[PDB]
């Protein structure tokens, strides 16, 4: 029913999303349960800093979750791209926890970093889609993102799944706080919804195809805060997928312009950023939540730290359709 | 005797830079004296981590030094964007040390963060040029890069001085390590060489002029390693000053316009090489900033080459950046635009 | 209606104790409110370690709670002697939290340490009874056990209140843990039972009197576990008040005099048992402080038995200690000595 | 030439002392080199706290060195008696380093703690006299105190050796500081001397025997600060060895009275403590350094943190001679 293995597994995303969660997340009393680390959480809760080492899309899932990780656990969280992390030979110690987010679980510069980390005493955690990958083997432990065999060039379904995992992670770390308890369920009750919210984004597919007639070599993702990671990812996409040139940037430190203005990332600074383009007159594309010279794509409103999950879909849909329109093997 | 103020203060650098070190560093016996911190140092030494909070160019000085703070001190160092950091509401604590870096001292978002960090118990440090700045009042302690009064519309000299500052900051903290004195005296000496070395790069002004006639709409700077800050820096200079578009990218990550490329020996990796290959293979001419006497392109291919002195790796950025100011200035002149 | 002030304030305890908790703890919904710390708490939570600095009896309240602070908070807790700590010049830092415990607030060595810790950047907390005390001024924050004005020559009520204090201190810090609410509500409830339970022990005054006629020159108190603070406490009471000699020892470590022995169920280990055996085997009579209804000695052997209510383990010490005050008082009376 | 295996190896102490040091300590440029941890120091220098778990004499070596350890490394150092440490079930984590000082390397409550520690994630370090003892086996690493087979009931030679090891340890941790560099050599140059300084204490042996005619069931060790550990050890001795009753206590928080008044531990508080007994009139025994109703035993003056090493010898000598005079198997 879909002409590309990239396209099916963009739509796979309602399921891939829930598979990520099934069993591990308990929605009625709110207990997330990652047996993958039942053995090491104790240690992590009490650890110096958590360092995120990842690549391509996996790097963007780290950005996208950093924010909520940190709030949820109060720990120095930081996100390092493995290629770089190596060049810089960051010092790392025994108190440190090193979380590696992989789809493949085979990425070279990751594995290198993993080794470096390992031989340097740090504790290691894999966040891997793949079964019995290298990473899987060498890590002290780590979650299996439990998505479904990814088979398109692009890390489409993988992304959102990782994102969810990463969250479930942050929750399970932080599961012994009465003060967070409120915000714990919120997110969880909201996670339950995420999968069907995914389907309702996949209806804009029609309006998105539509939008692919006025576009021409370029595109800018205009994000801030939570929806920053989404901007950069959307950017990675267009490039990686459509062999056009996108560049995600942070709203207004300052011509087809995607600008996320979902409520979770609606700053005056994003505001004036758009207001500033509307006066220039080039039609920007405004992603945001139902009921708010341009065009605007709706996305149902979720708990802000899950908001990134939805907003990225239109991004995949566009990028896919930008490569259909150019007759390119998307697989 | 220059046509713009901003052009002036670029050549102010082999001087602003000297004064930034002047009397704060001893070259005979290789120690570094930063008065302001004098009563907070051993404190900063024993601390959990360092968050550097900054804006525009100040963010980049922090990036360029980030690698080296870590190296010297082994304190975890995070570089943060003033505006952004705030939006996140990152949890901050007593054990924390928050270096605030400003040329001005009055940047709005920088301040709310200084207040924020202050509100939450953290130790606050202020690295500024400006005198009386809101910052330097409310910061627990701090330093004045002390480079002069900047009259150009963006941070040229300030960047480099800030840089220098941050580095002496990084040296101060690591002064009690015997297995470092080697690379300490490595760094401090090469520091002393900096200003004159700036001068050989300023001579490179002519070549840079002529380049601007073969460059227009958007520019790719390319960097990895130490020179990955300078990439986003030139990207910013170009972006702000010359009112073109630019973007620095991490090299070897993944039609026919300019390509600045940094192949100084601190930042030469295979991926920086491949980076070039495919560009020289798409038969397009890059501009290769790199050390005097370097066959970076099998020379049969067309490409300019800007030529820079070779210094201590973590210092190189201070040089690599000048040609990119010089570039970002003349383009703005050529484009008619008043660089003040 | 008592013959000495000190005797008075012992029976003041089921009251001084109530006031120490009074309005600072909610029994319906099991949370604990300590005003003073209110703006320093989440800070104390995220901190490296806790050094408790104290003298005489105040040192012992800190010991008795040390086990339980750790348990509740998982912050590393070190108990230190004011005088000694100073002599060592222990290195202290910003991340540090230094609980100073005083009944008086003006103990000389306690102060120099508060200054010392202050001089060196550490967070300083003041747990005192006294109002206006030098301490409570200069401490960053702190609490008043708020137990009353102590007119006896040594710390009876104060100890127990201090204790209580420290515990509520320990509860406050661990209030945000869901896997603790169980033992929290365990502790807070048993706290509410404390004062009356004091009363059953004060009834034990008669028995204690008669004991003093079968006891003289030097006394061995014996303890391990929770009750190892109470050991050195009675050792001190006896030492100071009754002007005998005493010494508490950790039980089961390795001619014919008195032996106090604590066999309450918090502090019952094999080594506490063997401890007894060999003493009951040397055919000498111990005095076994322990819970009502306990065959601690196969009863055929001669030995008194003081009888104490059974409470939450970390609280037990508050009870076990009274009989030892009662002892240390009457001996001093009998010995003629003016206990004020 | 000595009538007891306890007595020989009290005198063995010049040699046992230097054997502890040979090769590992380099006296001319001042490098202490413990290959036993060449593999873990990196980690220890950077670790949360160091916890000392020991027994009998081994506990007292920890006290005796705590002081200089802490000054030399600035780390939370703490000394826990294993029996207790267990009862209290102290929480302990991955950042933590746990140093176990054993002569035997077989002590039960130690081994237990070691296990506890281990199964709780902490890093473990043995400080063991014995070759291939249990401790030896289970530790991440640890020094071999390299004394000589101890064969008397008492931990005589063992003590001082441990003490030295413990120091060499603290040094090697702290070996990368320019500010300490001064105080580093001082101690080292002073360590060189320690062994012969030992011999000159062993001449008081004559005067000590002598002193064992006025003594009678008791004895108090009166120490403060550095010489506190020595007081408690001297106390352990008399009891353990002579089946008399000693009780080491800290100077003056207030009748044959040993009071250490070596220069390293000469406080006004020790002062008034003695001055206070001289007025009572009972002849106290004053240990101190050559040239300063009582009796007084000389002990050459060493670098204060090594001072404890000497002062303990007269203590052994007395305790030995208190058990010769009572016709007790000292072996
Ligand atoms: O997602 P992996 O398997 O860890 O690899 C990371 C990245 O590796 C490369 O950068 C690819 O271009 C991406 O598809 C991918 O995001
Ligand atoms: O923090 P400072 O000293 O005011 O300067 C840093 C930046 O401040 C602002 O954010 C400017 O827009 C930037 O162009 C500038 O580089
Ligand atoms: O610290 P505080 O409140 O003055 O009281 C503790 C001790 O202070 C002094 O050191 C007294 O000599 C002790 O007997 C007393 O117990
Ligand atoms: O010194 P070890 O072998 O670790 O055992 C510790 C102690 O064990 C017991 O307590 C002995 O009585 C002592 O001889 C010894 O000091
Ligand atoms: Cl899992
Ligand atoms: Cl300065
Ligand atoms: Cl209060
Ligand atoms: Cl060794």
DSSP result, C116-166: HHHHTT-EEEEEESSSS-HHHHHSSEEEE-------SSS-SHHHHHHHHHH
Angle, CA A291 vertex, CA A288 and CA A296 arms, to 5°? 40
CATH superfamily name and code, D203-331: Glucose-6-phosphate isomerase like protein; domain 1 (3.40.50.10490)
Token output for A188: 């969880």
What spatial distance separates the first Cα and last Cα of chain C, rounded to whole Å? Answer: 16
Which residue in the set B43, B48, B94 is minimally distant from C43, CB to CB? B94
Q: Whose CA is nearest to atom 13 of ligand 3?
A: C56
How many Cα atoms sit within 13 Å of C198 on the Cβ side?
24
- The H or E element containing residue C261 is strand C259-262
Which residue from D202, D157, D191, D192 is spatially nearest to D299, judged by alpha carbons?
Answer: D202
Token output for C314: 């970390």
C-beta separation of C328 from C237 below 8 A: yes
Distance of alpha carbon A203 from alpha carbon A213, whole angstroms: 18
Measure B15 CA to nearest chain A CA, in Å: 30
C-beta separation of B98 from B50 below 8 A: yes
Which residue from B287, B285, B286, B305 is spatially nearest to B295, judged by alpha carbons?
Answer: B305
Please give the distance of CA B312 from its chain centroid, rounded to a whole number. 14
Which residue from C202, C209, C306, C217 is spatially nearest to C258, judged by alpha carbons?
Answer: C217
List, in order, residues 6 or more apart from C267 with CB less than 8 Å away: C223, C224, C225, C226, C227, C228, C316
User: What values do phi and psi take at B130, rounded to 5?
Assistant: -50, 145
Give the distance (Å) from ligand 3 centre to CA of residue D113. Answer: 34
Distance of alpha carbon C311 from alpha carbon D29, whole angstroms: 61
Other C-beta atoms closer than 10 Å to the C-beta of D35 total: 11
The helix/strand/coil state of A125 is strand
DSSP state of D104: S
Which residue from C92, C91, C109 is spatially nearest to C100, judged by alpha carbons?
Answer: C109
Which residue from D204, D166, D190, D163 is spatially nearest to D316, judged by alpha carbons?
Answer: D204
Inter-chain contact C84–D269, Cβ cutoff 8 Å? no
Token output for B132: 């009386």
CATH superfamily name and code, C1-202: Glucose-6-phosphate isomerase like protein; domain 1 (3.40.50.10490)
Inter-chain contact B76–A240, Cβ cutoff 8 Å? no
Picking from A87, A96, A245, A266 by the largest number of B CB atoms within 10 A of its own CB, the best residue to mutate is: A87
DSSP C31-48: EE--GGGGGTHHHHHT-S
Relative to the CA of C58, which ligand 3 atom is closest?
6
Distance of alpha carbon B286 from alpha carbon B294, whole angstroms: 15
Inter-chain contact B252–A84, Cβ cutoff 8 Å? no
Exposure string of B87-111, with b = 16+ CB inside 10 Å and e = fewer, is bbebbbbbbbbbbbbbbbbebebbb
Residue D57 Cβ inside 6 Å of ligand 4? The answer reads: yes
Alpha carbon separation from D286 to A97, B176, C65, C95, D233 (Å, rounded) = 55, 41, 37, 42, 16
DSSP state of D223: E
For residue A239, list chain B residues with Cβ-Cβ distance below 8 A: 254
* Domain extents in chain B: 1-202, 203-340
User: What values do phi and psi take at D296, rounded to 5?
Assistant: -140, 125
Token output for C235: 């050792």
Alpha helices of chain B — where are they, by DSSP H? 5-11, 13-21, 41-45, 56-73, 82-88, 108-119, 134-138, 157-173, 181-203, 205-211, 228-240, 270-281, 313-334
Give the distance (Å) from ligand 1 centre to CA of residue A19. Answer: 21
Other C-beta atoms closer than 10 Å to the C-beta of B132 total: 10
Distance of alpha carbon A287 from alpha carbon A301, whole angstroms: 11
For residue D177, list chain B residues with Cβ-Cβ distance below 8 A: 176-178
Q: Find tokens 């002579």 and name the residue.
A: D242
Other C-beta atoms closer than 10 Å to the C-beta of B112 total: 15
For chain B, state the CA radius of gyration. Answer: 20
Residue A55 Cβ inside 6 Å of ligand 1? The answer reads: yes
Other C-beta atoms closer than 10 Å to the C-beta of A291 total: 6
Distance of alpha carbon B288 from alpha carbon B259, whole angstroms: 8
Distance of alpha carbon B223 from alpha carbon B266, whole angstroms: 11
- The H or E element containing residue C80 is strand C77-81
Q: Return the partners of chain D (3 or more C-beta pairs < 8 Å).
A: A, B, C
C-beta separation of D165 from D24 below 8 A: no
Q: Find tokens 């005097």 and name the residue.
A: B292
Alpha carbon separation from B167 to B32, B63, C4 (Å, rounded) = 10, 11, 70
Distance of alpha carbon B272 from alpha carbon B260, whole angstroms: 12
C-beta separation of C75 from C49 below 8 A: yes
C-beta separation of C188 from C32 below 8 A: yes
User: What values do phi and psi take at B12, rounded to 5?
Assistant: -75, -25
C-beta separation of D246 from D235 below 8 A: yes
User: What values do phi and psi take at C70, rounded to 5?
Assistant: -45, -60
Other C-beta atoms closer than 10 Å to the C-beta of B288 total: 22
Please give the distance of CA D303 from its chain centroid, rounded to a whole number. 15
Strands B123-128 and D249-250: unpaired
Q: What is the dihedral of CA C86, C92, C95, C101, to 10 degrees?
A: 0
C-beta separation of A97 from D121 below 8 A: no
C-beta separation of B56 from B156 below 8 A: no
Q: Find tokens 């502890």 and name the residue.
A: D20
The CB-based long-range contact list for C287-296 (8 Å cut-off, 24+ gap) reads C287/C211, C287/C258, C287/C259, C287/C260, C287/C261, C288/C261, C288/C263, C289/C260, C289/C261, C289/C262, C289/C263, C289/C264, C289/C320, C289/C323, C289/C324, C290/C262, C290/C263, C290/C264, C291/C264, C291/C265, C294/C263, C296/C261, C296/C263
Fold category of B203-340 in CATH: Rossmann fold (3.40.50)
Does residue A177 sit at the C interface (CB-CB below 8 Å)? yes
Q: Find tokens 């309702």 and name the residue.
A: A200
C-beta separation of A202 from A316 below 8 A: no
For residue C175, list chain A residues with Cβ-Cβ distance below 8 A: 178
Relative to the CA of B128, which ligand 2 atom is closest?
3
User: What values do phi and psi take at A261, rounded to 5?
Assistant: -135, 35
Which residue in the set C46, C74, C178 is minimally distant from A177, CB to CB? C178
Which residue in the set A46, A74, A176 is minimally distant from C177, CB to CB? A176
Domains A1-202 and A203-331 share a fold: yes
DSSP state of D177: B
By C-alpha distance, the chain B residue nearest A47 is B48
């Amino acid at each position: 029913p879909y002409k590309h293995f990239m396209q099916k597994e963009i739509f796979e995303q309602p399921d891939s999303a829930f598979n990520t969660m099934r069993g591990r997340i308990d929605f009625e009393n709110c207990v997330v349960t990652l047996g993958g680390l039942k053995s090491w959480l104790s240690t992590i809760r009490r650890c110096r800093r958590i360092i995120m080492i990842a690549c391509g899309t996996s790097y963007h899932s780290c950005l996208a979750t950093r924010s909520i990780f940190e709030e949820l656990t109060e720990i120095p969280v930081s996100v390092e791209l493995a290629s770089d992390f190596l060049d810089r030979r960051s010092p790392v110690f025994r108190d440190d926890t090193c979380v590696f987010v992989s789809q493949s679980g085979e990425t070279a510069d990751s594995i290198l970093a993993l080794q470096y980390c390992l031989e340097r005493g740090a504790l290691t955690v894999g966040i891997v889609n793949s079964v019995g990958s290298s990473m899987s083997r060498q890590t002290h432990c780590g979650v299996h993102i439990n998505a479904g065999p990814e088979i398109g060039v692009a890390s489409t379904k993988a992304y959102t799944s990782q994102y969810i995992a990463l969250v479930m992670f942050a929750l399970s770390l932080s599961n012994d706080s009465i003060s967070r308890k409120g915000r714990h369920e919120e997110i969880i009750k909201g996670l339950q919804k995420i999968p069907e919210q995914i389907k309702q984004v996949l209806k804009l597919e029609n309006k998105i195809k539509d939008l692919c007639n006025s576009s021409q070599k370029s595109l800018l993702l205009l994000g801030r805060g939570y929806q920053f990671a989404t901007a950069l990812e959307g950017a990675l996409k267009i490039k990686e997928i459509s062999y056009m040139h996108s560049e995600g940037v942070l709203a207004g430190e300052l011509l087809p312009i995607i600008a996320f203005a979902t409520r979770d990332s609606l700053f005056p600074k994003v505001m004036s950023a758009i207001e500033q383009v509307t006066a220039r007159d080039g039609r920007p594309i405004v992603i945001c939540n139902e009921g708010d010279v341009h065009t605007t794509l709706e996305v149902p409103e979720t708990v802000d730290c899950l908001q990134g999950l939805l907003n990225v879909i239109p991004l995949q849909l566009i990028s896919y359709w930008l490569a259909v329109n150019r007759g390119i093997d998307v697989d």
